[PDB]
């Protein structure tokens, strides 16, 4: 609902969505248009 | 204490970063803690 959302807000005012109260959906991110870059500053990607 | 490293928890530096960086940080932990011992130890000797 964030990644695949059709129309994002612009960089100046960006829509903040809390991902919360759930179980990690990170496994489904594999097969898709995916990402120009996937860069994890907060943890290594395996710990996600 | 951070001792300049990004955190004072040993593992939380690890799982955040890929180890070749942790080797750098864990210095500032070890260099800090190892010192803090030699401070404490050298105290005890004098106090002893
Ligand atoms: C986003 O859409 C792609 C298909 O275009 C899909 O493969 C991917 O799993 C979707 N992302 C999420 C988080 O569901």
From Swiss-Prot, chain B:
Subunit of the fusion protein that is processed upon entry into the host cell. Mediates fusion of the virion and cellular membranes by functioning as a class I viral fusion protein. Contains a viral fusion peptide that is unmasked after S2 cleavage. This cleavage can occur at the cell membrane by host TMPRSS2 or during endocytosis by host CSTL. In either case, this triggers an extensive and irreversible conformational change that leads to fusion of the viral envelope with the cellular cytoplasmic membrane, releasing viral genomic RNA into the host cell cytoplasm. This is Spike protein S2'. It comes from Severe acute respiratory syndrome coronavirus 2 (2019-nCoV). The gene is S. The chain holds residues 968 to 1015 of 1273 of the full protein.
């Amino acid at each position: 609902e964030v990644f695949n959302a059709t129309r994002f807000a612009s960089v100046y005012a960006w829509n903040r969505k809390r991902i919360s109260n759930c179980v990690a959906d990170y496994s489904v991110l594999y097969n898709s248009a995916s990402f120009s870059t996937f860069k994890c500053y907060g943890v290594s990607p395996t710990k996600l | 204490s951070n001792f300049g490293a990004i955190s004072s928890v040993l593992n939380d530096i690890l799982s955040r970063l890929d180890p070749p960086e942790a080797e750098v940080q864990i210095d500032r932990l070890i260099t800090g803690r190892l010192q803090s011992l030699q401070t404490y130890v050298t105290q005890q000797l004098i106090r002893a």
